[PDB]
Design a protein around this ligand. Structure first.
Ligand SMILES: [Cl-]
Lengths: 51, 51
């Protein structure tokens, strides 16, 4: 990869944010700690523990 | 051959999409599948030793 070029496509931007950041197929690791719940994805938080 | 006498029954029912323990974390479903108990499969098929 040499250059990153903008295409200004908001709906595609949203779909990529969903795939990489919000609802990744496999999230980055986050080990549980006394101060945390153990979820590794935002998708999991609202699907299973909404308030 | 009775389904209730299958030694894989407790692990196969544990490794189910209907189990919150499995559902609540992204990795959990894959951890079951890699231990040859696929959560998306129906019970009798989930325990069958194929071929
Ligand atoms: Cl998760």
């Amino acid at each position: 990869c040499s250059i990153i070029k903008g295409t200004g496509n908001f709906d595609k931007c949203v779909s990529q944010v969903e795939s990489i950041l919000v609802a990744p197929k496999l999230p980055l690791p986050a080990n549980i700690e006394a101060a945390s719940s153990g979820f590794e994805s935002v998708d999991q938080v609202f699907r299973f523990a909404s308030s | 051959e009775d389904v209730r006498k299958n030694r894989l029954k407790p692990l196969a029912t544990y490794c189910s999409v209907n189990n919150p323990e499995i559902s609540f974390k992204v990795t959990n479903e894959m951890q079951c599948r890699e231990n040859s108990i696929d959560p998306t499969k129906p019970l009798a098929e989930r325990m069958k030793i194929e071929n």
